[PDB]
Amino acid sequence: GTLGRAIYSVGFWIRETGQAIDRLGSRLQGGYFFQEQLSRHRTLMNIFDKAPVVDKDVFVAPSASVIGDVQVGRGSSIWYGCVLRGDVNSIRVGSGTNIQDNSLVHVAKSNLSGKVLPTVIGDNVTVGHSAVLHGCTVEDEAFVGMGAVLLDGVVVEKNAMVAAGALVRQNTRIPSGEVWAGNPAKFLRKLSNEEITFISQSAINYTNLAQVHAAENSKSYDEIEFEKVLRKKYAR
Amino acid sequence: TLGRAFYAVGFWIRETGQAIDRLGSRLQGNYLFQEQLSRHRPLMNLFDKYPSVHKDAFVAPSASLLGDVHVGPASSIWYGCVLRGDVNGIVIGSGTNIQDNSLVHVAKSNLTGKVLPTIIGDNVTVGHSAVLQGCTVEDEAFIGMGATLLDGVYVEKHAMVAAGALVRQNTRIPYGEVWGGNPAKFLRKLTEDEMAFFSQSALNYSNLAQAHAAENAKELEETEFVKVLHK
Amino acid sequence: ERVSTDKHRNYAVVAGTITILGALGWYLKG
Amino acid sequence: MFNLFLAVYPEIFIINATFILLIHGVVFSTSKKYDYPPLVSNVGWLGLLSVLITLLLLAAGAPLLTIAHLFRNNLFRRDNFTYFCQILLLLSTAGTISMCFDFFEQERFDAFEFIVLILLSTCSMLFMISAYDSIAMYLAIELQSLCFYVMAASKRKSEFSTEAGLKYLILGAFSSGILLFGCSMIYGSTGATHFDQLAKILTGYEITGARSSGIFMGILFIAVGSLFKITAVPFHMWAPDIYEGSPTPVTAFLSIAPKISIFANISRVSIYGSYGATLQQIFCFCSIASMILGALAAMAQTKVKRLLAYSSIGHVGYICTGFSCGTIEGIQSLLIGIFIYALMTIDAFAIVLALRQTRVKYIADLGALAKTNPILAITFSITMFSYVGIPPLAGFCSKFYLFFAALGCGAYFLAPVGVVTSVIGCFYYIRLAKRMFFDTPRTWILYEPMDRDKSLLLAMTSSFITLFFPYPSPLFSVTHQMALSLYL
Amino acid sequence: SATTIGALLGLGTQMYSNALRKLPYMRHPWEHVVGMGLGAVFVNQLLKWEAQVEQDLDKMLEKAKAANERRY
Numbered sequence A: 001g002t003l004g005r006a007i008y009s010v011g012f013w014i015r016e017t018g019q020a021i022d023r024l025g026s027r028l029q030g031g032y033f034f035q036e037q038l039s040r041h042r043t044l045m046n047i048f049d050k051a052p053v054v055d056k057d058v059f060v061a062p063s064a065s066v067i068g069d070v071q072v073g074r075g076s077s078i079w080y081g082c083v084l085r086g087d088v089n090s091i092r093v094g095s096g097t098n099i100q101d102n103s104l105v106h107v108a109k110s111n112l113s114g115k116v117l118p119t120v121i122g123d124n125v126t127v128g129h130s131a132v133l134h135g136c137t138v139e140d141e142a143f144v145g146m147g148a149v150l151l152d153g154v155v156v157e158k159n160a161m162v163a164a165g166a167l168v169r170q171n172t173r174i175p176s177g178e179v180w181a182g183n184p185a186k187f188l189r190k191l192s193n194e195e196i197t198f199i200s201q202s203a204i205n206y207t208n209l210a211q212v213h214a215a216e217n218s219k220s221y222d223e224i225e226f227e228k229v230l231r232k233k234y235a236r
Numbered sequence B: 001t002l003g004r005a006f007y008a009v010g011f012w013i014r015e016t017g018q019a020i021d022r023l024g025s026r027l028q029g030n031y032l033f034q035e036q037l038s039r040h041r042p043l044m045n046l047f048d049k050y051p052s053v054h055k056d057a058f059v060a061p062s063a064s065l066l067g068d069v070h071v072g073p074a075s076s077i078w079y080g081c082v083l084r085g086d087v088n089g090i091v092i093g094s095g096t097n098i099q100d101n102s103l104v105h106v107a108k109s110n111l112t113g114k115v116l117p118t119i120i121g122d123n124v125t126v127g128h129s130a131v132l133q134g135c136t137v138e139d140e141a142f143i144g145m146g147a148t149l150l151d152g153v154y155v156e157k158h159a160m161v162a163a164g165a166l167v168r169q170n171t172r173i174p175y176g177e178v179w180g181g182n183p184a185k186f187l188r189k190l191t192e193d194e195m196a197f198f199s200q201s202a203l204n205y206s207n208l209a210q211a212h213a214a215e216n217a218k219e220l221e222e223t224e225f226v227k228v229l230h231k
Numbered sequence C: 001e002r003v004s005t006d007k008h009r010n011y012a013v014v015a016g017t018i019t020i021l022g023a024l025g026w027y028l029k030g
Numbered sequence D: 001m002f003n004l005f006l007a008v009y010p011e012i013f014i015i016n017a018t019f020i021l022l023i024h025g026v027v028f029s030t031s032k033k034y035d036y037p038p039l040v041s042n043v044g045w046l047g048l049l050s051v052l053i054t055l056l057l058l059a060a061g062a063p064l065l066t067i068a069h070l071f072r073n074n075l076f077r078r079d080n081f082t083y084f085c086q087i088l089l090l091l092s093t094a095g096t097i098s099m100c101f102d103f104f105e106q107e108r109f110d111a112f113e114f115i116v117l118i119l120l121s122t123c124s125m126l127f128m129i130s131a132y133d134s135i136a137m138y139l140a141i142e143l144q145s146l147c148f149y150v151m152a153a154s155k156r157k158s159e160f161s162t163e164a165g166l167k168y169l170i171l172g173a174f175s176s177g178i179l180l181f182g183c184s185m186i187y188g189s190t191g192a193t194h195f196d197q198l199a200k201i202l203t204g205y206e207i208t209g210a211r212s213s214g215i216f217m218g219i220l221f222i223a224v225g226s227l228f229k230i231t232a233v234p235f236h237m238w239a240p241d242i243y244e245g246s247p248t249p250v251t252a253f254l255s256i257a258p259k260i261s262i263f264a265n266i267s268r269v270s271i272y273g274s275y276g277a278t279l280q281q282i283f284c285f286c287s288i289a290s291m292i293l294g295a296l297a298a299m300a301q302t303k304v305k306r307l308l309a310y311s312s313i314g315h316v317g318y319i320c321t322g323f324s325c326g327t328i329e330g331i332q333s334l335l336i337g338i339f340i341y342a343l344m345t346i347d348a349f350a351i352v353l354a355l356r357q358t359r360v361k362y363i364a365d366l367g368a369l370a371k372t373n374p375i376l377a378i379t380f381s382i383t384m385f386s387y388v389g390i391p392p393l394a395g396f397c398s399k400f401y402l403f404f405a406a407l408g409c410g411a412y413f414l415a416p417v418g419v420v421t422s423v424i425g426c427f428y429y430i431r432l433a434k435r436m437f438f439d440t441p442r443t444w445i446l447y448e449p450m451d452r453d454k455s456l457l458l459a460m461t462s463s464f465i466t467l468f469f470p471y472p473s474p475l476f477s478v479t480h481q482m483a484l485s486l487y488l
Numbered sequence E: 001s002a003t004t005i006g007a008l009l010g011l012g013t014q015m016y017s018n019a020l021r022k023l024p025y026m027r028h029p030w031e032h033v034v035g036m037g038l039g040a041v042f043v044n045q046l047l048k049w050e051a052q053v054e055q056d057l058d059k060m061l062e063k064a065k066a067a068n069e070r071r072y
């Protein structure tokens, strides 16, 4: 009503007063405080023309920069803090994979002296936290996780795994079904069959978890506020 | 510390400002001042230890450089760096690459003045997943990814430290040396074409950084913003 | 789009500003 | 209204507020339109508002609150004594409600009736202070005690609630029964029940006569009765047990509010209807018994609530020692001690309530409060050292003026026992506090910390305790006014 | 000088109430002024009331003189 109009005007006035006080405070400060900006961060971007091609049913955490020509298929996930930077050469990851948070993928030597190096990740590959992948070809259903790093034209194959510190270097053809470790990499076991089923079940249930995180992380402000008030009132 | 007194009273005043603004908003009937959104200022100060990046030096908007950190031209701070300069400053020269997933850290306060600085002198590549805590790396340096440089280490003048390797306290890698493994032991010598390649990679990443920044300055794409406000 | 559309809050705000004005007047009559 | 009821405006207003809050609570607690809101918090804040309004009315109106001299003298007489006692009572009730707001939601028990009784017993006690007849006194005491009976057994799904409430009910009802028989015998042997008549009939001429053997039995029974309601250390049965069982807001209110009321009532009767040595002797014994018991029991306890119970018994004892003689200086120091004790105990309960949930029942859970919350540990040490004794604080100053008055009044015996129980308390406590940086077995980092109002109330009282000695003139002056105008 | 003691008292008590709960000292820097005001008005009124009650007590003692004058 008219009362509403009046108090709206009054609220606008005192809000202006607040802005003025804030500027006065920054100017009493000054030179030091880097006042806040908007996000200005890209979850997806191109480089020269290559736009990313991302499946619809994927999860991409809004703290994961995909840049270049990244072709990411179905039922996969690019978790938090991730960096899929293929600005120089092609990146294609299989369908049903998962890059568990805070990992990186880069490629270097596009079409120099004839020899080229793409980078491909097979289906149902579960690369873990802090995994560095620098120009590699990981065939489908292979396990790499917890801080591993692959240096060069390495190719892992068909259920092989490198675990927890594997620094694999300079064009290693990983045998079809093993485990490696070591700094540098050597094998020490035989990768039992129930463990193969472990990596498969890992890919599957991790796709499930990624779908949950997507449904959560892709909400708007009003829906989030509703969810929060409902959670509080219910826990009451 | 009169500056710090001014800073504190500035906080009081600006805080009263925020509070009176919020009272105004509640009166106006608009609770938009709750849309939780990460601050993450890519460049941050503490009291007067603000960073200083030279113009034309690409810093990815997802980086995090805070504390007394100073960096010169032709440099690149690629997505996912933590450049801390709280206790002892970081200085980084020209034509340098600090790649994505790297921190140039400074040891949390040890008792004495044992908090060494960190100097990264121009024409240096510091690849992905690189932790440099309190070190002195010099011109024409290669720190190939998976790297750890613990406090007290000095690498210089066309020197390479391979990959996935850590260098303990008080170790020096002078010209023409590669060290690797846990701990970092000497392997072999270098090659002149490899040194020229160091320089060429430095230049190539300088150009890459120019491109990435010129793309990051592309007007924010209002269409997606109005989309996300629609639904 | 130039008004507040919550009746209860507006009544409460009227009461609050009346309260502060009354206290100021009371003090003025100390 | 009619210009006579100007003498009972605080009581009229507090009763009307109680009724309107009761109706509001019940209807909007059972109204299906809203979800099914439990109105404990809203009813509580409205109750605190009503209590502050009562405080305002009473305080700003006293000189016309004495307006209905005789027509009200039929039941009660209001003098400066009743004025200041009622003010302190309303302050204590506002304080305890504000302190107990956060407990309601945390412990999660939904009954707004809990905060329609606090007000009702408050009006009862306001009647009890300004009470000038034996039966009006008894009726006010019964109304208050019934409110507390309801308040005790709150949470039914718990265990200690029902047993503690039943113990308290039986104890209180027995006490009131004894008090009733006492008033009955006084009536029978004397033929009057209004304090003016009792004074005029049995002052000075207490000389033994034919049927003088009756009055004495009545006053003895009244002494026993009123004693039971001051926890009566020979009759202190179950007092630590009920303190431990009943919830923390309830036991806080039970410790602070009724005790001041019954002390004012005891003073009003002992000035008027006593004997040369009957009441003074029936209290001189309980005083030393209380100090001794407080010492030799609080020395060894392993539950942070029972320790509070026995320290309360000890301080009630010190107060009763102050009661010993009947000179102006003595009663002055008596009232001062009452006030300081009220403050210290609301403080201690603020702390033990802000340390509640993660420490359901423990004393060893001083898990490095010096390390996990230093300011709170310093505040607890301050409150306790004040509770026992140390260089200038509030409790030390109060005990010192108590013993000053006792010595100067002709009793060279209460001081030794008083000082020695004080020194054993001090050794124990200062051993406990200095036991807070030896080592720490358990650790209970707490989700509890003191929302806003417990913190404000604490901060206020704790700043008062240390800062009391730099200017204790007005308290002495107002206490002198009060005690002097109690009878003269 | 009374109002200054009151203001410092209010500010101290407010910093206290902000320090009990572990949040920083000057959390709401616009409460501290209310604390100073309340402390000032409290101490001023306390001095006024102490003077008044001393006056009333002295009058009461003067009247008690007559109650014992007739005693002699």
Ligand SMILES: [Zn+2]
Pocket (backbone or CB within 6 Å): A106, A107, A108, A134, B127, B128
């Ligand atoms: Zn690279």
